[PDB]
Amino acid sequence: EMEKEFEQIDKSGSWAAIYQDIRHEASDFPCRVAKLPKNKNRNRYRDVSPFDHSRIKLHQEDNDYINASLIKMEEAQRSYILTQGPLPNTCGHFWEMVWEQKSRGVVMLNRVMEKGSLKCAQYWPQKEEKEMIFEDTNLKLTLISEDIKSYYTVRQLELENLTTQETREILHFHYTTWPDFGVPESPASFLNFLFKVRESGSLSPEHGPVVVHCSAGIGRSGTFCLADTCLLLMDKRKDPSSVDIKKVLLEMRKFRMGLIQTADQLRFSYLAVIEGAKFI
Ligand SMILES: [Mg+2]
């Protein structure tokens, strides 16, 4: 089991050697286009960049870059787009992606301000009456409804393509309670939040991939996907004890760098899969 592989790592006090192992074994691939000098200001971080093979392109002749990777999990029949938190210049690109990738849910795992700095642009409308328009990508975004809770908030949003007059219902699943520092004491709210996303159909293949982000789109986002996928694979396989988290993490890392930024988040992911495994 991992229940008992986990308890071994605690007692041996060896979490950061495990996590460092994952780092060394991890895939490295080129990020040529992320690093073109014209996409400088499309990136929040000089050291978080999408691999070329797995990057999302914008359908437009001008410049097709966005900092977003498609994580494709063959066996679990799950796909995700991990991306950075929209910058003020990239909110339109962000909704273009949502539009073009035919996504149903956006999963956001940061507050707009954390530790006193801005971690993300306010990329969505706060009031029904005051809708956003992205002139660069000819999109309208309207807040239809909003349902706020202890550990998370959900929003019904309407996304109109102004070029073509078609509109679409996007679901905004905001996890609002990840602490500024470290990780949650228990993984129970986070799992709860994951199930709520699941319940919406936003992860299901009737739709294009969910778009998941924190500020960089690798830390908390990684945990979300890794926990979701590991549990699905636990549901599917003849032998559930066979799912290796380290193996699944390294697979996910073939598609985006950096997934799980700390040994804490790793412990936490293990943890959330084990606790999540008892709702089963
Ligand atoms: Mg009002």
CA distance linking residue 107 with residue 90, whole number of Å: 17
Contact in structure between 96 and 253 (CB atoms under 8 Å): no
For the sheet containing 167-175, what is the strand order? 68-73, 78-83, 210-213, 105-108, 167-175, 152-161, 139-148, 132-134
Task: State the residue for tokens 């000098």.
Answer: 37
3-state secondary structure (DSSP) of residue 190: helix
Determine whether domain 1-280 maps to CATH 3.40.50.300. no
- Residues in a beta bridge with 6: none
Q: This structure's resolution (angstroms)? A: 2.5
For residue 192, report the distance from its CA to the centre of ligand 1, in Å: 28
* 150: enclosing H helix or E strand: none
* 135: enclosing H helix or E strand: none
CA distance linking residue 99 with residue 125, whole number of Å: 17
Contact in structure between 172 and 155 (CB atoms under 8 Å): yes
Asked how this structure was determined, the answer is X-ray
As a dihedral over the C-alpha atoms of residue 120, residue 94, residue 195, residue 236, rounded to 10 degrees, the angle is -130
Contact in structure between 227 and 216 (CB atoms under 8 Å): no
For residue 129, report the distance from its CA to the centre of ligand 1, in Å: 7
Tokens, residue 121: 């642009």
The CA–CA distances, whole Å, from 222 to 49, 71, 151, 174, 232 equal: 15, 10, 19, 16, 15
Contacts of 212 (CB under 8 A, 6+ apart): 80, 81, 82, 83, 106, 107, 108, 109, 221, 224, 225
Dump strand ranges (E) for 122-161.
132-134, 139-148, 152-161
One-character DSSP codes across 53-118: TTBPPPS-SS----SEEEEEETTTTEEEEEEPPPPTTSHHHHHHHHHHTTB-EEEE-S-SEETTEE
CA distance linking residue 85 with residue 221, whole number of Å: 11
For residue 186, report the distance from its CA to the centre of ligand 1, in Å: 34
Residues that are catalytic: 214
Residue whose C-alpha is closest to residue 133's, from 104, 162, 98: 162
Contacts of 190 (CB under 8 A, 6+ apart): 175, 178, 184, 223, 224, 227, 272
One-character DSSP codes across 18-40: HHHHHHHHS-----TTTTSGGGG
Residue whose C-alpha is closest to residue 157's, from 184, 127, 116: 127
Query: Are β-strands 113-114 and 117-118 bridged in parallel, bridged antiparallel, or unpaired?
Result: antiparallel
For residue 149, report the distance from its CA to the centre of ligand 1, in Å: 18
CB count within 10 Å of CB 190 equals 26
CA distance linking residue 215 with residue 110, whole number of Å: 7
3-state secondary structure (DSSP) of residue 157: strand
* 48: enclosing H helix or E strand: none
What DSSP designation does 208 have?
A: B
Binding-site residues, please?
A: 180, 214-220, 261
Contacts of 67 (CB under 8 A, 6+ apart): 34, 42, 43, 44, 48, 49, 50, 83, 84, 90, 217
Region of 252 (left: φ > 0; alpha: ψ -120 to 50; beta: rest) is alpha
CA distance linking residue 77 with residue 206, whole number of Å: 12
Residue whose C-alpha is closest to residue 203's, from 188, 224, 218: 224
Tokens, residue 96: 């273009």
For residue 234, report the distance from its CA to the centre of ligand 1, in Å: 44
End-to-end CA distance of the chain: 15
CA distance linking residue 270 with residue 246, whole number of Å: 9
Give the relative orientation of helices 220-236 and 263-276 as an angle to the nearest 10 degrees: 30
Rounded to a whole number of angstroms, the CA Rg of the chain reads: 18
Contacts of 201 (CB under 8 A, 6+ apart): 104, 207
